Each structure stands twice: as C-alpha cells, then as structure tokens.
C-alpha cells in the first residue's frame, strides 16, 4: 500500500478529517506515528518474546517474508585510517555499514578458509581468555565491539598466524521513514529521520496492515492522554 | 492534568474580590458585545463593529468644514442641529440623505457661547415650516431658531 | 486555556487567526505569550478538532515560572491590526489542584 | 533522530498529538527528561532483570547494537603521583578514565603474559586471603577499589614476582546529554551535566524511540500524575 | 550533576517554584531530602535485600561504580592513650576512622604474617571460646566491639605469642551532605550534618538520578502528609 | 545529626515540608518521641524477627556499626554486702552495672581458667540438675537471675572446688535521651529518663535517619491517626 | 489555622508580613503566639504556595 | 488531621450563643472593611 493508501486507511479507521478548516491529524503526525509503528513491529517480530506467538525472525515463513526486504549483505571496511587502540593484541578493527539495524550472520574469509563469526559476551571473553590456548575453535572467529565514532567498529579476534581478507555482514537494514507528503510545503523544517520528502515504505505488504493498526492504536492512546495507556503501549516499544 | 473549569460570559463585573469572583462574569473587557447584533451572537462574546465617515456635502455639492468645538446637538425629526464654537460661533442643519449629510449654515456670528456652558435643547414639530429648536446655556439668555 | 472561537471575513471562515496575545498575572506573577500557531513545530496556540487551546504563559521574571496560585487573572485579546468578527463562545481552564 | 526531531515527536506523543491539551513543557525540561530517560534505558537494558525480556548487555543482537556506540577501550594510568596507602602489599594503584559508566572487560599485560582481571568481592577477598598461597590463578588477576578522589582508583593485585606494563579497560562510556536548544539564550544559567549548548544523542538510533517514550511517560507522571505514579515509575529508574 | 543541576532538576520534576514571593521548597529542605535520599540509596544498594534486584555491593559492576567514590582504606590507631578494660586477655584496642560508614575488609600485619580479620558474632565468640585451644585459625584473626566514646573501638583478638604491627581497614566513607547554597545567608544556624556551606555530592554520577528520584518521591510523600505513605517510604529507610 | 538538626528535619518530614499544615508539636513531645524511637529501633534491630531483613545484632556490618557505640565492657561486683538467700548452694551473687540494656557476652576468670558463661533457662536448670554430676562442662559456667533490688543480681553457678576472681560483662549500654532544648526553661518539671537538659544522641549517625523517620511515623499515628493506627504501629514497639 | 491573605505597600507586594498575633481562648483556656516566620527554623507561622 | 472548616466573613454578628454562631459572620472586629473601597475588596476583610 503506497503512502496515500496508508493515510486514507488511517482516516477510515481513526476518523480524523482531511479538511484544513478543522485541523485534524497532520500528515507529519501520521508519518511520525507510522515510523514508530514500523520500528516497534520490527523490534517485536524480531525478538520472539516481543510478540504474542513466541516467534522471531526465522521461526515461521511469515516472519521471513516480513523481514525479507530489510535483509542486506555487505562487506566490512578496515578501520586502519584511524590508529586507535584495541583491547586485544590480534584485533583487526573493521567498520560496519551505516544503515545497520540488527546483525544476524557474520563470516570472515581468511587464508585458512571461511570461518563463521561468533558474537562473544563480555563474560565469555574473560572465561575463554583465562585458559591456556586463548584462541577460538578451528572453524569460528570472535567479535567484540570497540571504540565507535558515529559508526559501529568491531574487533575481529581471529586465531593468530592468519590474515583477514574479507568480512561479510548479513544484517537487517534500518527501515526508512513512512512519509505521506513533502513536509517542507506546509511545515518549515520538520523531519522524521533526516527526510523531508515522501518516503514510501520499504517493507513487504504483509506487515503494512500491522503497521497501520499499531499507528491507529498509538494515535488513540496519545489523544487519550492517559498515563496508564501510555505505559501499556510503551511496553511494546522494544 | 487533574481538573477543569468552564467559564461563561454573561456580562462584566467589578468591585468584587478575586477570591469570590463568579465564573459567569468577566472582570474587564474592551470593545466587546455580549448581545446579538448583526448576527445571532447573544451571550457569546463578539467584536464591536467600527464606524464609517459620512461626508458633510452642501446642497451645491461642495464640502462643508465645521468651524470648531461642539457644545451640543438636537435631532428634531431628521434634521440634526449643531451648535459649535470656534473662530466664530456657528449653527448648522444636517439632514441625512442616502450617503451624505445635506449641511447648511443657519448662522455664523458672535452669539456669546462658552465651552464651560454647553447647550441643552428642546425641539418641536408644528408644521412643515415651523420647526423650532429652543436651547439654553447656563450663562446666556435662552434663544430660539427655526 | 481551552476555548471555542471562530473568526470570519465577509462570510468566509478564517480558522488560522483567533487571538494574538494572552496576559496572565496574579499578585506575584505576570506572563505573556503571543499566541502563534506553527503547524509542525510546537507553539503556544494550537487547534485540533475545532477546539482552540493555549498554554498559560510563564512569568517573565523566571521563564521556568508556571502560573501557580489560588486565583489568577486571564486576559485574551487581539492587539494586531485586523478587520474580522471574532465570535468567542466559551473558555475552559484546565488546572492541577 | 535529531534533537529537533526529539522535541517535535515528544510533543506529538506527549501534549496529545500536538493539541496543546496537556501541561506545556519547556525545552530545558524536555532536555532534562530525555537525559534521565537515556540513563534509565541504559541501566535497565544492561541489567537483565530491569527490562521485560530478561536480557542484559550481550544476550541478544539488539542489546549489542544498543550499547555499541558507548563501548570504549582505554588504558588505565598509574597513580604514582599520589603516595596514597593501599590495602594489599602488592597492589599497584591505577586511575581509570573519567568518562566511565560501567566496566565489562579488563586485562593487564605483564612480563609473564596477558591476564584477564577478575573483579573480586569484599567477601571473596577475605576467603581467598585466608589460604596458604594467597595469590591468583596462573591466568587471572584481582582488582579491588580503594581511595579515590573525584575519580576511580583501582588496586591491581597481580601475582608477586611480576610487573605490570599495561592496563586496558573496555568500559561503557558515560552518555552525553540530550539538549534541544542553547539554554543560555532564554535561561540564565542552567545545565544538564555541565553542558549548556545543543547536544545530539551519542547513541545508536535503535533506542532513540525508547528514550522518547520513556521521557513521555516521565513527563506524564511528573506533570499529570500523583505520588503513586511517581513512586511506581521510579521503580524503572535503576 | 553539580548541586545547581540537582536543584534545577528537582524543580523540573516536582514543580516547586524558585520565586521567594510564593515560598515553594527552600534550598535547606531540598538539601535535607537529598541527604536522606543518598543515605537511603547507600543503605539499600549495599544490602542486597534492600533493593529490587537482590544485589549488594560487589554483586554487579553497577553497584561497584556506585560505591567506588566512598571506598576508603585507612589504618587503625592504637587506643593505648586510655587505659580502659577489655573483655579478652589478649585484646589490643584500636581506634577506627571517624568518617566510618560500613566495614567490608580488615587485615592485620603481625610478625607471623598478614592475617585477614573475621568479624565474629557474640554467639560465635562463646562457641569458639568453650573449646580447648581458644585461638583463631592460622590465617585469620578475630575482632569484636568494645567500649567506645564518640568513636569506634575494636578489640583485636589475634593469636597469642604474636604482636600487631599494623591494622588496615577498607571501609565505605560516610557520604557528605548535598547542599545547594550557603544556608547561613537566609537561614540563621541550620545545618545538615554540621555543614552550612555548599557541599557538592561526593558520589558517582551513576546514582545521582536515583538520589534525585528518591528525593522527589520523599518530597511528594511529605507534602501529602498521609501516614500510609510515610510508613511505606520509611520501609526503605534501611 | 545534632539535636537542632533532629528537630528541624523532623519538622521537614512531619509538619509536611515545614508548611505548618499538621498538628503543631512541642520540643518536649519531639524529645519524647525521639527517645521512644531510638528504643524501638534498638529493640527491633537486635531481634532479627523485628526488622524487615531478618538480621539481628552481628548478622551484617550495618548492624555492627549501628550497635557499635552502645557496646560496653564492665566488671560485675560481688553482692556480699547483702546476706541474701540463693537458690543454688555454690552460687556467688554478683551485681551487674546499672546502665545495662542487653547482655551479649559474659565470662568468668577462675583459678582453673577463663570460662564462658552460658545463660541457662529455668527448664534447662531442672533438666541438668536431675543428673548424676550436676555441674557444668569443663569450659563453661552457668548463670541465673535471683533477687534483685532496683538493680540486676545474677547467681554465678560455677563448678565446685573453684573460686571466682573476675566477672566481665560485654553488654549494650542503655541509650541516653534525645532532648532538643532545656525543658526547665518553658516547662515546670518534665523529664525523659531523669534528664532535663539538652542530650545529644549517643549513637552512631547510621541509625539517626531511621530514628527520625520512626519518630515522624509515631507523631503521625498519635496526632493524625485513630485507634487502628496506634494498635498497628505498636507492633513495632518490641 | 489555614488562611489566604496578602499585604501590600504602594502597589508592591509584601509576602513576609500578614499578622502579628493570634489570641485563641474559650471558657477555660487562653493562649497566644506572636505569629513570626523563620525561614529555616520552625515558627508559629509559615507560608508555602 | 481529620477534618476542616472554612470560615467566610460577610459582616459581624453578636448577641448569639457561641454554640450556635454561624461561620459566615465574625464575632468581633476592629478597624476592618468588608466592602470594596479604593480596591475590589468586597466580601474580603481589608484594612481601614
């Protein structure tokens, strides 16, 4: 459903009025609510415990089609430009794409061969670095976060005596805003996520209806103004 | 928030304590009308309509400038009678036509007038020619003009 | 300050201009805002669903000073040149006691 | 989202949908509430028991991307400038960075080799110092906090007959304030954390909507709620 | 957050007014409430069962950073000046620092070697003094409280045939008051804990927000005046 | 806190925040309530079942520092002045100190050696005196209370063929009253525990806030509550 | 005794001085206080909001 | 505490029993004016 249909169905279900004599719900307001609704839907349908079915990304075909048009595969770029300091001795710092939302699969191609990357926790790092060998298994590599500046930088801790030739990242792309009209026309300099023009939704038509329903619920709870509703529907903000 | 209070406007009231003022009255208001005039705006605050100048066109058509300060007027049936001081002490007759006042000068001289003693008049209609205007100052003799 | 009102110009409705200033003061406070309406950005005056609503000003001495007292004088009025008829029906005052 | 976007969406969520039907909020107050919100979200999403999912820092990809832009790796500096008194005989005092929020991994490079540091409790210290050897294991080092003056000083208790050449600390950086406008323009002298100018959020866009919603709930509780609302919503402040 | 920010954010969240025409909340009152709030936060985050997470001093990094800027290490001074009477025959009385809040680690360096001190209960003393040897284990020393005069005195019951050369005490320093303004200006001789001037908070910025929220809750419950709220929030006074 | 600080913070907690919106309280009444509060806190924090944590005297460091400034070690004096009648044949009557609140450790030094005293119950006495030997174990001594006249007299039942040379008592001293002003100035003749002048709290500053809060609750119950409030709050008087 | 009141001095508000004595009495009692206001210390008269 | 009672000042009354006095009246007053003179102080006690 293109953005015009989004706004029209928002009108059908929320009873706001299109006339400017009685200011109803502005297109900026509906754009903001739809952006928040799609972000919430992504965060709830990704984590299995955020929805009512207990199913996350790859637990059913419907979730797969929901997240299909956000899955992106890109390469990591070496951070040798900045001579920063790492936490490990054998850590090659790599910069990730800017339009990153969630990482789901990482791989590194070394001279020995491709090795899937394991996101290791701060406790597992201390646990496995208190042992004799202090290296990963033959078919895996470690990854921890490091000093980042308006980006995301990762320390790729691969076993010594090896060199990193590539770093692929399969990730969920950051969803773009849902904007129904050029906001610069009536509204001076208002933006959603740095965008002022029409931004048609970049997601599958499967969850367009869920986004619309969530936006309508958020609009009703916002106009109600009750604190209880605000907290109850902020519970689903993650 | 927690609570609300509706306020109605039935007039304007003063002289009462702020702690014991009443919501149906206003404490002060400039250029408002709470009565239905030119529309059905009764009990609803509305603007006060503005004025419109009327020219004092003589029967010949030339403009008529009034000498100076006014002391009093008199509307007999449709003829307004102005008693004005100034350089001289003049008298006028204004008749309201469709868009202009047919202004005539009934006298211009030294009728002893003073701004401290304004005019108070009575006017009668006895026939089409005897339309009198009696007027009195607190200083000078009482006078008449047809 | 919730309040209904309508402004007209020779039979033609004007839903953009109702008032132009709001003085609110008491024994120890005095604040004022211009009651402007910006569609996208927050503004002192904003309308939705044919009911205007305005924020009571904050005292000029301290801009963080809300109007808080047992009673307060509230003054609506146009003080910019214009020639419109402004029917001003009612005015509700939301407060926290 | 930009700080202007933060304010406008905050007035679209709070203040009903920009109806001016709730207590008017200033820019300083909005900045304060957004700062409080970001601290609250950080503290709740680090501790697994503070959130609704039961997941902490590195228990899911979402938390990793949430805390990504706060992870900082820095070196500790020897505190030999002040001849203070230590609690242990073999303790080399080190000063931690000033912009420290939470420590998650610490390591020390000695002449023998790198040794992951274990934060030992006040009871575990007494338990392990009542034994014959009274030294750590071959591949670990101990750390306890000591006299600090407007900073954080740590006692590095490494095994005897060894020297410390480096002390690296991977820590969560203190978040910067969220300020929507130059506070010195309208307000005389007011600050959030010692800052008076505009301050963009130094976090990933993932938790920006969560921060906005938490700020909305805080505003609603403070400006439209009673004592019960404040007490109930202060539970999620830790 | 310096004390000015403390008061300003107290104003933002509690809606008290800064003007002296309408007396709102005095700076002395906010100082008192903040002092009580920080004391309560210390007592609740120290004891694991006082908070909602079940975590005390050294059960998480956040608690460690919370209590970092209070941990102090100091030496005990012999009480040979006063020839008082002890409860044990081999008890050397020692005076502790005046700015003592809570003890967490104690050690004594004798001619035999360093020995961690065990705080023994009044029942354990009778239990272990009803046995043949009546001495501690080879690697520990006992400690019990004795007659104290505006201080804290401890009987150091170390095994006989040994001499005490040092007595180190790692303890949580007594927090200083939080005062926003020189109280002597408007208020004649009011004090918080013997202090009348500005006393910037000596704790980490981590728990500044918790202190502020607790102070706001206490202020609301005090102005409410309800007995039920007073008892409910006095439950958290320990 | 000083007594003036006690009164001022009491009027900041009770009396709303110094709004004069609750029953006015005099200085004598405040002193009485503070004294009652300190006795209540002592009795509740000694008995583990009286508090909310389930911890008594020496079950945590906080309780130790709470009771630190009340622990007193004193010698018992032989009661040979009065030829009273004892219940046991080998009982040497001893008089305890007058400023005694609670006994926690008692010992006797005999010619054979020091022997920790066991407070035996009225039933355990009958049980152990119905046996062949009818004497304590080699390393303990018995104690039972007997006829006392405005004091405390104790029957020291030590094993026969032995003599008593010393009787040490480590006890909790009776707390002194908390008086804010010289009561003889305004009031004719009123005392708290036989004291009319200003009396600073003879306790550690740890429990001063707890005493203040308990006094506030007692004042609220007495001066703003009904019979139910008094009955409910009298439960915590023991 | 809760009560609203305001004192002025040539248009200028005075929020410090309202009354100076309070006699309350009955068939068998008679008391009086001076109604002073001390900002920090407790006093018979205190204003807030 | 438990209860409250608002009192208004509409004038001054005497000759009535204390047990049956009315809250809207004052029992005695010196140099007061309950009428709006020089200001809008009607029904509000003000100085003379």
Numbering used by the authors:
A (entry chain C), D (entry chain D), E (entry chain C), F (entry chain D): 1 to 238
B (entry chain A): 2 to 147
C (entry chain A): 1275 to 1371
G (entry chain A): 1275 to 1323
H (entry chain A): 2 to 49
Give verbatim lines from the article.
Virus ΦcrAss001 (Kehishuvirus primarius) was the first representative of this order to be isolated in pure culture from human faecal samples. Here, we present the characterization of ΦcrAss001 using cryo-electron microscopy (cryo-EM), enabling de novo structure building and elucidation of functions for around 1,440 protein subunits constituting the virion, leading to the identification of a novel ‘crass fold’ in the distal part of the tail. The extended tail barrel formed by widely conserved paralogous ring proteins has a high capacity for storage of cargo proteins alongside the capsid cargo zone, ensuring that the proteins required for the initial stages of crassvirus infection are carried inside virions and delivered to the host cell.
At the end of the tail is a large hexameric assembly of the muzzle protein gp44. Serving as a platform for assembly of the large domain forming the distal part of the muzzle is IG2 (between residues 318–1021). As this domain adopts a fold with no significant structural similarity to known protein domains, we refer to it here as the ‘crass fold’. One role of the muzzle is likely to be the formation of this constriction, preventing leakage of DNA and proteins contained in the capsid and tail until infection is initiated. Owing to the restricted channel diameter above and below the gate, and interactions at the inter-subunit interfaces, opening it would require conformational rearrangements of the IG and crass domains. The crass domain, owing to its location on the tail tip and the presence of multiple exposed surface loops, is likely to have a role in contacting the cell surface, thus initiating these conformational changes. A further region of density inside the tail was observed at its distal end, next to the ring-joining domain of the muzzle protein. This region corresponds to 6 copies of a 14-residue segment containing an α-helix.
